[PDB]
Amino acid sequence: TEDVAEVLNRCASSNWSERKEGLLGLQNLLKNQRTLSRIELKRLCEIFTRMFADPHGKVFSMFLETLVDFIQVHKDDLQDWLFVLLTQLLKKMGADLLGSVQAKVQKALDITRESFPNDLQFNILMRFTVDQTQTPSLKVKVAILKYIETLAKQMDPRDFTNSSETRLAVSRVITWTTEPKSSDVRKAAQSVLISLFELNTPEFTMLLGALPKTFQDGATKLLHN
């Protein structure tokens, strides 16, 4: 009930009932601020990575709820796991889950967004936007874009720089702004381009300048006024 190794064992169980009991134990450990060692935290991150694909609905919803406490308690020590946390949550957010479950993903995303350095979050988001080892659905794109937009409202101007990756990401967004299959992508992409422009105008102007006449003018029609 209070042993860390055993709680993590129950979370890693192939049996759903045991995973449920483990998450209850883990939640208790977090509420009681029972601290984890470094290798315990590493093991828990590995368990949670797999939990993103948990086939049992109750276990998965309980996992999403536990994430809030987990992130809040261990955010200082979770920077190396941030890529996995954020990208997996955005995939879940774009998977068209039931309303009640989407709320829990959104909540976990909101907690993430306020718990980690902005530049680090932003850099993960730029790489994820271009990520070539996968092909995002329309709803995954929406979720990525909405998150960018919200992150842009809390960022420092110098968190956004004219680099190759950020240039490669903004290019993709430009075209997604003309997206015929989804009005939601359209509005989300525009808001992203708008927010990044208003965040750091000069650095965004430099970005546009280093793009072909297609992306440059396409964005120009939007950014006026």
Short mmCIF file of C-alpha atoms in Angstrom, two decimals:
data_model
loop_
_atom_site.label_atom_id
_atom_site.label_comp_id
_atom_site.label_asym_id
_atom_site.label_seq_id
_atom_site.Cartn_x
_atom_site.Cartn_y
_atom_site.Cartn_z
CA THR A 1 0.00 0.00 0.00
CA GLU A 2 2.89 2.40 0.82
CA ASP A 3 5.90 0.64 -0.77
CA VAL A 4 7.14 2.54 -3.85
CA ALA A 5 8.62 -0.45 -5.74
CA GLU A 6 5.34 -2.36 -5.25
CA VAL A 7 3.12 0.58 -6.25
CA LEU A 8 5.12 0.91 -9.48
CA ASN A 9 4.88 -2.88 -9.95
CA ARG A 10 1.08 -2.68 -9.78
CA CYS A 11 1.07 0.20 -12.31
CA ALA A 12 3.20 -1.92 -14.67
CA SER A 13 0.88 -4.95 -14.34
CA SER A 14 -0.71 -6.47 -17.44
CA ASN A 15 -3.87 -6.74 -15.30
CA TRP A 16 -6.13 -3.65 -15.36
CA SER A 17 -7.45 -4.12 -11.80
CA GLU A 18 -3.86 -4.10 -10.53
CA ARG A 19 -3.00 -0.99 -12.58
CA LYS A 20 -6.02 0.74 -11.03
CA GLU A 21 -4.89 -0.22 -7.51
CA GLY A 22 -1.34 0.95 -8.33
CA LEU A 23 -2.59 4.36 -9.51
CA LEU A 24 -4.59 4.73 -6.28
CA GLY A 25 -1.38 3.92 -4.35
CA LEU A 26 0.64 6.33 -6.49
CA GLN A 27 -1.93 9.11 -6.04
CA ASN A 28 -1.68 8.56 -2.28
CA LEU A 29 2.15 8.65 -2.43
CA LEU A 30 1.96 11.98 -4.27
CA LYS A 31 -0.65 13.48 -1.91
CA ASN A 32 1.45 12.37 1.09
CA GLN A 33 4.57 13.80 -0.62
CA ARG A 34 6.31 10.42 -0.35
CA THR A 35 9.37 11.28 -2.42
CA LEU A 36 10.84 9.12 -5.17
CA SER A 37 14.47 8.31 -5.86
CA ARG A 38 15.98 9.18 -9.25
CA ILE A 39 15.72 5.63 -10.65
CA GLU A 40 12.19 5.28 -9.25
CA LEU A 41 11.15 8.46 -11.08
CA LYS A 42 12.85 7.18 -14.24
CA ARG A 43 10.93 3.89 -13.94
CA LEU A 44 7.65 5.76 -13.32
CA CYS A 45 8.23 7.90 -16.43
CA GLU A 46 8.73 4.68 -18.40
CA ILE A 47 5.50 3.24 -16.97
CA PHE A 48 3.62 6.46 -17.77
CA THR A 49 4.98 6.52 -21.33
CA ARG A 50 3.36 3.11 -21.90
CA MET A 51 0.23 4.16 -19.96
CA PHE A 52 -0.52 6.65 -22.75
CA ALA A 53 -1.52 3.56 -24.75
CA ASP A 54 -3.48 1.85 -21.92
CA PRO A 55 -6.40 -0.07 -23.49
CA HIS A 56 -8.60 0.08 -20.38
CA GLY A 57 -10.78 3.21 -20.20
CA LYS A 58 -10.97 3.48 -16.40
CA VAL A 59 -7.22 2.95 -15.93
CA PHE A 60 -6.45 5.55 -18.63
CA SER A 61 -8.76 8.21 -17.16
CA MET A 62 -7.27 7.58 -13.70
CA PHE A 63 -3.79 7.89 -15.25
CA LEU A 64 -4.67 11.29 -16.76
CA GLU A 65 -5.85 12.47 -13.32
CA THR A 66 -2.69 11.22 -11.61
CA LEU A 67 -0.54 13.14 -14.15
CA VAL A 68 -1.72 16.47 -12.69
CA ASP A 69 -0.30 15.64 -9.24
CA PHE A 70 2.76 13.96 -10.75
CA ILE A 71 3.64 16.99 -12.87
CA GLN A 72 2.97 19.42 -9.99
CA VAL A 73 5.20 17.50 -7.55
CA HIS A 74 8.09 16.57 -9.88
CA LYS A 75 8.18 19.30 -12.58
CA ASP A 76 11.75 20.34 -11.60
CA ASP A 77 13.02 16.83 -12.35
CA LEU A 78 10.94 16.11 -15.49
CA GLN A 79 12.63 18.21 -18.19
CA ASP A 80 14.11 15.17 -19.97
CA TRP A 81 10.67 13.51 -20.02
CA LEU A 82 8.93 16.66 -21.27
CA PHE A 83 9.12 15.74 -24.97
CA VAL A 84 7.22 12.52 -24.27
CA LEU A 85 4.70 14.09 -21.87
CA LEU A 86 3.76 16.99 -24.15
CA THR A 87 3.71 15.18 -27.50
CA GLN A 88 1.77 12.19 -26.17
CA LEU A 89 -0.80 14.52 -24.59
CA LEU A 90 -1.21 16.37 -27.90
CA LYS A 91 -1.73 13.07 -29.72
CA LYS A 92 -4.38 12.12 -27.14
CA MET A 93 -5.95 15.58 -27.46
CA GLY A 94 -6.14 15.00 -31.23
CA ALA A 95 -7.52 11.45 -30.95
CA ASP A 96 -11.18 12.60 -30.62
CA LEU A 97 -11.75 10.98 -27.21
CA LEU A 98 -15.06 11.27 -25.35
CA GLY A 99 -15.85 14.67 -23.80
CA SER A 100 -15.13 13.61 -20.21
CA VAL A 101 -11.73 12.17 -21.19
CA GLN A 102 -10.80 15.15 -23.42
CA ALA A 103 -11.32 17.41 -20.40
CA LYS A 104 -8.70 15.38 -18.49
CA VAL A 105 -6.20 15.60 -21.38
CA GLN A 106 -6.80 19.35 -21.67
CA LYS A 107 -6.28 19.69 -17.90
CA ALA A 108 -3.00 17.73 -18.08
CA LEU A 109 -1.91 19.96 -21.00
CA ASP A 110 -2.76 23.11 -19.01
CA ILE A 111 -0.76 21.86 -16.02
CA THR A 112 2.18 20.99 -18.32
CA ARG A 113 2.06 24.43 -19.96
CA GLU A 114 2.36 26.25 -16.63
CA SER A 115 4.90 23.85 -15.09
CA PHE A 116 7.88 23.95 -17.51
CA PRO A 117 10.17 26.59 -19.07
CA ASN A 118 8.55 28.19 -22.12
CA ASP A 119 11.54 27.98 -24.49
CA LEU A 120 11.91 24.22 -23.86
CA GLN A 121 8.17 23.66 -24.45
CA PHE A 122 8.31 25.78 -27.61
CA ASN A 123 11.32 23.90 -29.02
CA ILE A 124 9.54 20.57 -28.55
CA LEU A 125 6.53 22.06 -30.33
CA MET A 126 8.60 23.19 -33.32
CA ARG A 127 10.16 19.73 -33.78
CA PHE A 128 6.78 18.01 -33.27
CA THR A 129 5.13 20.19 -35.95
CA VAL A 130 7.71 19.04 -38.53
CA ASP A 131 8.15 15.51 -37.10
CA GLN A 132 8.64 13.26 -40.14
CA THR A 133 8.27 9.88 -38.38
CA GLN A 134 4.45 10.26 -38.36
CA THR A 135 1.56 11.94 -40.20
CA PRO A 136 -0.77 13.95 -37.91
CA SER A 137 -4.54 13.94 -38.40
CA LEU A 138 -6.50 17.20 -38.72
CA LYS A 139 -7.42 17.08 -35.00
CA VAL A 140 -3.80 16.48 -33.88
CA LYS A 141 -2.83 19.58 -35.91
CA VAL A 142 -5.59 21.59 -34.22
CA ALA A 143 -4.36 20.50 -30.77
CA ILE A 144 -0.70 21.31 -31.56
CA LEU A 145 -1.69 24.74 -32.93
CA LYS A 146 -4.02 25.65 -30.04
CA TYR A 147 -1.22 24.79 -27.61
CA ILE A 148 1.34 26.89 -29.54
CA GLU A 149 -1.08 29.80 -29.54
CA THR A 150 -1.66 29.58 -25.76
CA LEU A 151 2.09 29.17 -25.09
CA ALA A 152 2.76 32.26 -27.23
CA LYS A 153 0.53 34.33 -24.90
CA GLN A 154 2.80 33.51 -21.94
CA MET A 155 6.23 33.45 -23.65
CA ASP A 156 9.08 35.95 -23.61
CA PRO A 157 9.89 37.47 -27.04
CA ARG A 158 13.39 35.88 -27.00
CA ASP A 159 11.89 32.39 -26.62
CA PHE A 160 11.06 32.70 -30.32
CA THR A 161 14.05 32.84 -32.70
CA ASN A 162 14.58 32.69 -36.47
CA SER A 163 16.29 29.30 -36.69
CA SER A 164 16.08 26.50 -39.28
CA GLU A 165 13.69 24.35 -37.22
CA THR A 166 11.40 27.27 -36.37
CA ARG A 167 11.56 28.38 -40.02
CA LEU A 168 10.67 24.81 -41.06
CA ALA A 169 7.74 24.78 -38.60
CA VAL A 170 6.27 28.18 -39.52
CA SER A 171 6.34 27.10 -43.21
CA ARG A 172 4.08 24.13 -42.43
CA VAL A 173 1.72 26.38 -40.45
CA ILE A 174 1.40 28.86 -43.37
CA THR A 175 -0.02 26.17 -45.66
CA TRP A 176 -2.24 24.69 -42.93
CA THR A 177 -3.81 28.17 -42.89
CA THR A 178 -5.34 27.47 -46.32
CA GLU A 179 -6.47 23.97 -45.22
CA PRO A 180 -9.66 23.07 -47.17
CA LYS A 181 -10.53 19.96 -45.10
CA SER A 182 -10.78 21.88 -41.81
CA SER A 183 -11.98 25.36 -40.88
CA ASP A 184 -10.56 24.51 -37.43
CA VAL A 185 -7.03 24.10 -38.78
CA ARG A 186 -7.54 27.34 -40.75
CA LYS A 187 -8.44 29.40 -37.66
CA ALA A 188 -5.84 27.68 -35.46
CA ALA A 189 -2.98 28.26 -37.92
CA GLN A 190 -3.89 31.95 -38.37
CA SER A 191 -4.04 32.52 -34.62
CA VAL A 192 -0.61 30.83 -34.32
CA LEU A 193 0.92 33.05 -37.03
CA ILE A 194 -0.79 36.12 -35.52
CA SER A 195 0.42 35.34 -31.98
CA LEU A 196 4.02 34.66 -33.05
CA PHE A 197 4.05 37.89 -35.08
CA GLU A 198 2.71 39.93 -32.14
CA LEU A 199 5.10 38.17 -29.74
CA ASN A 200 8.29 39.06 -31.62
CA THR A 201 7.64 41.21 -34.70
CA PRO A 202 11.26 41.85 -35.84
CA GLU A 203 12.32 38.19 -35.45
CA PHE A 204 9.16 37.08 -37.28
CA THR A 205 9.78 39.59 -40.08
CA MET A 206 13.27 38.08 -40.47
CA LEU A 207 11.67 34.60 -40.52
CA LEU A 208 9.28 35.57 -43.35
CA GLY A 209 12.15 37.16 -45.31
CA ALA A 210 14.02 33.85 -45.28
CA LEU A 211 10.99 32.07 -46.82
CA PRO A 212 10.00 31.73 -50.52
CA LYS A 213 7.55 34.21 -52.11
CA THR A 214 4.75 31.66 -51.60
CA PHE A 215 4.82 31.42 -47.78
CA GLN A 216 5.86 35.06 -47.41
CA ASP A 217 2.92 36.58 -49.32
CA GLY A 218 0.47 33.96 -47.99
CA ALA A 219 1.27 35.15 -44.47
CA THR A 220 1.33 38.79 -45.64
CA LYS A 221 -2.38 38.60 -46.61
CA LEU A 222 -3.17 37.42 -43.06
CA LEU A 223 -0.88 39.73 -41.05
CA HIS A 224 -2.46 42.83 -42.62
CA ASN A 225 -3.48 44.63 -40.57
#
